[PDB]
Amino acid sequence: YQRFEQAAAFGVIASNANCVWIPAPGQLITSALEDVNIWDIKTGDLVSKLSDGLPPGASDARGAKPAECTYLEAHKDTDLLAVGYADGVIKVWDLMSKTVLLNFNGHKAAITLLQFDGTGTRLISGSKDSNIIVWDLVGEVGLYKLRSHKDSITGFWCQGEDWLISTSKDGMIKLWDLKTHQCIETHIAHTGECWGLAVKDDLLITTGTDSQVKIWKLDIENDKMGGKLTEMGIFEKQSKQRGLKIEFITNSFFYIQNADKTIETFRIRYSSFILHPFQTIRSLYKIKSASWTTVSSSKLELVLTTSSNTIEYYSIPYEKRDPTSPAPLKTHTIELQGQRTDVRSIDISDDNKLLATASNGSLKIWNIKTHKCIRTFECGYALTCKFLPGGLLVILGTRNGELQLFDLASSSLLDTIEDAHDAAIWSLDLTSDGKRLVTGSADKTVKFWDFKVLKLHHDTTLELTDDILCVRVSPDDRYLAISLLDNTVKVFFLDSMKFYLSLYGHKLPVLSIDISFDSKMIITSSADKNIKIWGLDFGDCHKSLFAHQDSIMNVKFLPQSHNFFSCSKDAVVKYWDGEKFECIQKLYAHQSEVWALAVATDGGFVVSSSHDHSIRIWEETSLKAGERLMEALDLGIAEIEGLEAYNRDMKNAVLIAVNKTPEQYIMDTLLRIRMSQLEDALMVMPFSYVLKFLKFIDTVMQNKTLLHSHLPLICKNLFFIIKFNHKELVSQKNEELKLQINRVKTELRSALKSTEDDLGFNVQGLKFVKQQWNLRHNY
Template sequence: MVKAYLRYEPAASFGVIASVVSNITYDSSGKHLLSPALEKVGVWHVRQGLCTKTLTPSSSSRGPSLAVNSIASSPSSLIASGYGDGSIRIWDSDKGTCETTLNGHKGAVTALRYNKTGSLLASGSKDNDVILWDVVGETGLFRLRGHRDQVTDVVFLSSGKKLVSSSKDKFLRVWDIDTQHCMQIVGGHHSEIWSLDVDLDERYLVTGSADNELRFYSIKHESADGESVNGGEESSIQNKWEVLRHFGEIQRQSKDRVATVQFNKSGSLLACQVAGKTVEIYRILDDAEAKRKAKRRVHRKKEKKHSKEALEGIENVDGNNENKGNDSSVTHGPIETSNPTVTVPDVFKLLHTIRASKKICSISFCPITPKNSLGSLALSLNNNLLEFYSIEQGETKKTLAIDLQGHRSDVRSVTLSSDNTFLMSTSHNAVKIWNPSTGSCLRTIDSGYGLCSLILPTNKYGLVGTKDGTIEIIDIGSGTCVEVMEAHGGSVRSIAALPHKNGFVTGSADHDVKFWEYQIKQKPGQAAKQLIVSNVSTMKMNDDALVVAISPDAKYIAVALLDSTVKVHFADTFKFFLSLYGHKLPVLCMDISSDGDLIVTGSADKNIKIWGLDFGDCHKSIFAHADSVMAVQFVPKTHYVFSVGKDRLVKYWDADKFELLLTLEGHHADIWCLAVSNRGDFIVTGSHDRSIRRWDRTEEQFFIEEEKEKRLEEMFEADIDNAFENKYALKEEIPEEGAVALAGKQTQETLSATDLIIERLDIAEAEEKCIAEHQEKNSRNVAVFQANPLMNGLSPSDYVLSAFSDVHSNDLEQTLLALPFSDALKLLSYLKDWTSYSDKVELVCRIGTLLLQTHYNQLLATPAARPILTVFSDIFYERVKVNMLRVFMFFYKLKLCHVWYIKTLLSESRF
């Protein structure tokens, strides 16, 4: 009989406040801060300091294990998040749901920006392309190509009519959205451009790079008749396409490269964040203040010139001639001072410099300016921390810090209580107590660098072994460190409880394995009872003790040494029993099964070995992970084993059959530790990405053979995808200057959808022929027609229409492009019937538009297409117009689309 197993699936992830790779941003209301948390986006209420909502990709989506690379918020409740696989998800922050997924980029999304109305979204990527998306239509409009390196930032100009993009290729490009071409290429930067932004009135555009200066550009605006607002000089032929004009530079204080430049919403402040610990805040002066400052600058310059000339006149014998020269300069002075030229230092004045405790990852201005302050700035640090600063005229104050919900560094150990009600985790400076069911942090205790931990069976105290060789006693109820004991001369690497005894064992780098006893009693002079720990005995080893494990009957103790061996001794007499030799690198983890029959070891040589504890024979050696195995543990009362490694994977094994059962993905960095509940219903893992993840056992059964076939299919599909990408990568040449291409990309999903449409077109065509033949033979309807059961009782037209039910709006273009002309002609013939469905109006319009644009020349040259095109010209537009008005007015009442979108669609006289 084939054995069935129960599946484990990802259940929860907690402990991450802010990721390192992405930016933070406020929502439109200014009450919530959007912070990336690996593959999720956390919505934090700023005043309460709580995460009110988490935007999590569904398990069925393409890239749940891919981290968020960039975030942008629209003027409405929509939020866009870009991922490492090039996909973009549009979220509704009020509902907390994913509205749509946009697939177009071939590399990680590095820049996102909405226009002022929120109807358009621009994205830049590592594939060097910029794509413009229609947010309402949930589709890509076009792809702008021309950059020679990664696009770092994008910004809209002229109310969304123009787009400026920056890149690592040291150039700015200005794109005209209406004509879809590159209007201007701006050079002058000596290194990669990392960020750019524009003020509220679109007067200045600022860029930040690795240079020691910020570059500013003045923006040319055009009036309604197309002439330049700034005068005839700029409207000359030479300056016809010039949108950005170099205005000047400001020397920065920091030598680090610029990471982010950002104006606040009112346009009164400019923040320059560098790839370090500082943020420079500049105040933007108005025109009157800038002119006064320019006059003072010119006046000081002239005073210096006068004083210099006076000194030269005294020294010069011919004083009269010098005085005449001075008089001439003075006469021209008032004319220059009356209307001086305003420069960048006259407009932008350094106000404050914010210095954080750790490296700053990203910044964001609050769109709402608090009272009695110039603005509020949020910072995300690389130690999983959010800080908020109030910018005032005289100083900057830190108003809030969100840090309790996560560790400042990687999670080095996790351990569960005996009743699985709470979880203890350690890092380099803190111990945290969690509720594993909800993921909420219950306690935070300052500590040393905790390498291992243990919760005593009473569930009142916890033990933490530190890198300094101490053992810290943690009172879980009060959340305090009761005592710090000097236990070892080296770092404490492992703690194991003695079964059925009030004791535990520690292994250290000082070659000692110590046995300890504990009891809870009242100390002299103290009212409350406390945990008292005492050393009972010490076992000397020949090398560093990396791991210790105790058999369930407390008869044996296994010690993994630095010399890659595992020594098994009798726990009572310390007499040598067995030596487990076979690993090529040190054993980093091991565990003994509940029945004491098996011992499993994981090593830095990427293998796990299963041994018999009776004779010490190696039952099986398995190449388990692509990197070091960091933790292994048996499921209680079974021979099932979980292992984790630096390859970011969790693997589930059957130690009797030596088979891999499951591979669980989710972590974004090395996994350091593992804990299995005493019932085996869930496991907890801790990682270098600072996250703690819970994996729950479900009621779904699976079989080994099915999982093997599934893994082979995934490998096969991955090879096909890689070959497909490489094939087109070889054919793809350097794009032309300012080239425009399609926004979408061909994927396995679009090819499958195309195959489905072709299949249903063939079935529907055959069904129509059968219906026609039946009607000819049975004009009196004597016989009943037997419909094709594959059509599920649908008409041929509806059967073909149902093929589009699972086609995503963004994938429709690529799906139809792969259709042969003959099938495209068949599809056009069905559009007339589909216009009667009012809820399919937009789909019909898009299908007709794409097919006509793609096959325009062939349709004109094909006589069989003329009847279909004639139907289009006669009734198609009228039907669509009537249904369109009804549908979009209904949507507008539900606030699902904008008024401008309805007007645009109704004003179109053709596709």
Template sequence: MVKSYLRYEAAASFGVIVSVDCNITYDSFGKHLLVGALEKLGVWNVRQGVCSKFLAPTPSSSSRGRSLAVTSIAASSSPSLIASGYADGSIRIWDSEKETCETTLNGHKKAVTVLRYNKMGSLLASGSKDNDIILWDVVAEAGLFRLCGHRDQVTDLVFLDASKKLVSSSKDKFLRVWDLETQHCTQIVSGHHSEIWSIDVDPTETYLVSGSADPELRFFTVKKDFDKKDTGSDNMEYGLDNAKKNTPNKWDVLKPFGEVLRQNKDRVATVRFNKFGNMLACQVSGTMVELFRVLGDSESRRKAKRRINRKEKKSSEGKSESAENGNSVAEEASEILVTAPDVFKLLQTVRAGKKTSMATTKTSVIELQGHRSDVRSVTLSSDNTLLMSTSHSAIKIWNPSTGSCLRTIDSGYGICGLFVPGNKYAIIGTKSGMLEIIDVRSGSCLEVVEAHGGPVNSIVPTADGFVTGSADHDVKFWEYQTVTKPGQDSKQLAVSPVRNLNMGDEVVVIAVSPEGKHIAVALLNFKVKRISNLLQLGTVFNDRNVFFLDSLKLFLPLYGHNSLVLCMDISSDGDLIVTGSSNKDLKVWGLDFGNIRSSTYAHEDSVMAVKFVKNTHYVFSVGKDSLVKYWDADKLELLLSLEGHHSAIWCLAISNRGDFVVTGSHDRSIRRWDRTEEPFFIEEEKEKRFEEMLESEREKSYAPTEEPPEEGSVVSVGKRTGETVTAVDSMLEALDIAEEELKRISDYEDEKSQGKLSDFRPNILMLGLSPSEYVLRAVSSVHTNDLEQAFLALPFVDSLRILSYLKDWVNIPDKVELVCRVATMILQIHHNQLVATVSARPVLSILKGILHKRIKECKDTLGFNLAAMEHLKHMMATKSDAPFRDAKTKLLEIRSQYLKRAESSGQTKEERRRKKKKKKMDSDHVWS
């Protein structure tokens, strides 16, 4: 009988607030903060400091089930629309209210690095590591064109001139200005000495600022009058001291305005203006944010005038012609050159306690929910209700079921840890060689014990205490004690060493058998040794030695690894030990004779942790290849390969019942994998992995090798993927079925005309649709963004067949836009063949007469509807303001009548005030 196993699946991910490689931004109202947390898009409530929702693509929409990290986020002016870019180059547009993905845009070949909406929210510009910029029509859900020219990763984008211009920055040290109407680069701005990381423009589009690794911020003025011819005076107007060096160009949009020296020398991460344009924030890659105040015209001119006066005063020292100097000052003041230091004044420098991810005002701190560095160890309590994780400077206690953080405790660099029996205390081994005793209930560190002279690499529980292994070559045995501290009535936990064993080399990892008979120690020099009550993993070159228990002599040597052993574990019955090494191997040994039972190439990189499921011979292993693998150790056969982490996995913990597994990674996340009731068989999983490998090879073949485009060129937006090939197959299948159905209908009509009556049964595959409707259904099902690539892959003969159906589809009002797109694409792709094909001319002639008429009808309908909506909007605004205007007018009339009566009575203002006060007092007296 074929053996079946129970499947493990990803259940939860926690411990990550924001990914390192993703920006953060506010939504259009400023009420929520949008962050990328690995594959999820988190929406945080700013006031409450809690994550209100997570937006994540379904596994079926991901690439072969592998989760993709969010690399960039942009919020639209529309309240609910959010765009997120991913590591595979795809872009998803989310509706945060419905928590659904509205559309997926595929165009970039590498990770998306920047997204930027225009003010109306109708256009979306994206930059990528493939050095290209793509402009997307959000309404049509399609790409407009691709801009090529940068020679390195695009880092930021800014729209100008009512979305007619686009400014891009790159790691190639250049700014480029693109004309979106003519789709070409109009200006290349040089001058930066290092990679440009961020740019921004103020709301009035007067100043543009760029930040790089240079010690200063560079400012540019944005030219708005593009018909004005540049002159020397124009250069002076924009503060160009080196006007002679710069050749004036009337098409230049950006004019250098000056530089402002920064306080911090780290590279700039983000520069942003506030929505009013009176503040500028510069956030560096460290922990500092510099805030600049943007001065007004009069204030900046006064500042520039004072600067000129100081300069003139210095130059006039030692001269007696004060009058002439005064005249020169006055003359120069009349032609004041306002530069960037005169406009942008450093207001405040904000230093955060940790590295910042965006320039923000510190109103609240969100740090409880995750580690700020790698998760180096995870440990479950004996009842599986608590999970402890260690990292660079903190210990966190979690609820593994909900993923909520219960305690955060400051500590040293924790490498390993364990729960003391009873789960009230925990022991942490640190990189500095210390043991920290933690009170789990109070979340405090009770005592720090100096245990080793090097990092404590491993800590394992025993029946009456625990064992530690360190880089100082020692393996120490510890026992628990309870002591009463001076001045305290209650007792607390303490530990003391009872035995010490020097191994002669650095101890990498240790393992103790559940029955307490054996202990395994892996050393830095690849040793494999076994002692009765002491098992050492030692060098392959050592002689075999047998030691006795009473004298701690070697009992049984094991050897076979030819590289560093990084992890190991012993099965519950004490029969097997599994080891993983840096050469990606996994080996299973028998503890009876010390022989290798089986060995396999397990991971694509070093194996970092292995664990047996309790009371079984099933093993979990994790590695630097970011995969979790499930094995049957009896045959050392791969059962499952679990994907989810985005970086190297360092640690692993399994519950006592084996119903869930917890892993910690370099991506700072902690993930839980639950055992389900779904059975599976090894052969089925092998077939799945083989199909995934074939699919991966197919995807590689879909992307043809293309020559890099010329600088400043505009190329097509689409990217050929598996979806486009599937779309082509569906259209070809629909065309064949429709053609066969048309032939059957024609034969039936001929038989009917000849008097041969027979029943006609439509093809059941067409679902009751006519041949034209069936083909239209197949074409309409293709995603708008994939339509161009699908027609590029469609043969000319089949394109001609689709062209013949367009004259029928154009009469459907809601399909006019689709028909126009299809007709335009076919004409562009197969222009030469269509010109040379005589049979195509009648169809083209018919479409030429129909399409223009239908497009004009749709345009008139849309224009009429827009005008009607504007009229209704104006009427509603007028009606809503009418009561307020009437009330205000009435109040003004009453006030003027009162003043007229008072003036006619001859009362002064003071008398009227006293009379009013007395009247009020009388009224209060009556009511009382």
């Protein structure tokens, strides 16, 4: 029982967010997974990375994948970098002190757009849900919450501290005020959604789904709908793919970044009259984000980041007439710290020299102590890897029917046995001395090779009835386990291939085999979401263990005892004991499919490449009615008499909180009361509060509109209170009460007579209409 957490993170170059450019070219900020990467461009070395205080898989860790940084933006004058994650939290770092200082949370989904005026010390954020929030930093709170869209907020722009424009995944554009504090104008821009929006001071450019971009004008003309927005021009045929981000540039250009590995830079000097397509920029990877830079209007320098971990640069010299170049200039490329595609196999040396191979064939050698690369090689779609201890060589099995070997000291190709198999070779193991290789391949073939001093030569092959998925040779070199295409694990004696034993009962193809150091336990993993532990002495199922909701991708033992690691497609690495049969630890490091796993030969650190290019080195260590009416009566009438005394001189926190005049406050608690309690709650109060009630009623009779709003409730309460306290009220003597009762009587009688007159007119007229129609059209 120990606790291991991660200690490194490789290939984390280009995550899913937008790059932010900084002048001195100058350095560049991009997003890492659960971190932020900053680096210079002439060198490409990671200057700093800012993560949180807990490493994943610790005691305080939670049973959930952490939210990745999905957006970010920084002010270089104030040097504040706000960062928005996938759950809707907004953190913000300083760059000089390199620490987060305050956090917000007002959204519910991923945060799309972040912008902040440091001159206004406020921060506007629009996320994947419908609400646009404005926080303020020195007030450290959400000032308000703008919300009228329904799908998301994809396009977003602000003007001063006065106006806003926003568009969504339902293609409507909303012009918002800030003083009147509401959505004012909406216009449906495109048929489907409206992805992109860029606002120059006069025109705004909005792109949709089928290269339909629109060019409109902004103004502060005071019509209800005209002036503030038009439908001026429509430009088409930029591409076939939907636009994603438009950005303006002037020392008279802008650019539209699409999703078809293309940016189109346009010039502004009907759509052909205004616009001018300057040029295109094309890459070979699906691009993600871009930012511009220019000097003296003689060159155009763009920073781009793709889907794969490539940071590209672009430069075009020009003369305000001619782009001068048929193709741009990639003067800076940053790839080497990334893998450029999804990794598929990992191995660890006894020197602990890490080996990572992927779809390119780009075998990259890493190491723990430097966290950087040593060398790369390329061989095509390579599936599995192997580290050879003698000479510390590497071997790659591919999807093409070919088997390669590279060296860490000499060049790539020392030997390449091609046409090794017809279909793909899937798994590959090596005897513990290093003399015999064995490969399991989709020709239903188990090819055994000898290591001739160097070359390889297949000394034999084995032919099976079913396709082959995994092959594992014993560490004691006694057994050889094959996981077939059907739910079958055949165990052979290694010396003579005797077909010693067979294991069944997975209902799905077994994707991984491992056997123990003393060679008694064989653990097996299929896509059936349960791991099966077997004793190999009798082919018996010691146990089954349901785990890893998607599919257990790979299982590895520890060299000390029966303690194993399981990694899945649903991004969880579980550490189990094979004698207690309970999960000791449940790591939630990254978020995509944990493709490749490798345990240390002696130490205990595990590395686990995900689908999102993740290399992980795991190393170890309540009042009653009547009462509420009475107190509201007290507060309101105290305010009323204070106002009266102040008016004669001229001759509450709850009030200023709820923003109600005290008469409306008292009427609101009268509305809040219930009738079945109103009887007793009116009978309870003493005559002092009765007299206060009559003063309040006279105040409402002054404030007529409330009276005609709530005529029957007022009348019922007044008639009951005077019928109850009738004796003392006629026993008292108060001339001001006499005038109050006179005014109350006159105004109540007048209001009731008015509504009675309306009712009588209506019933007489409608009776006449019925009688006339009946005498007319009834036979």
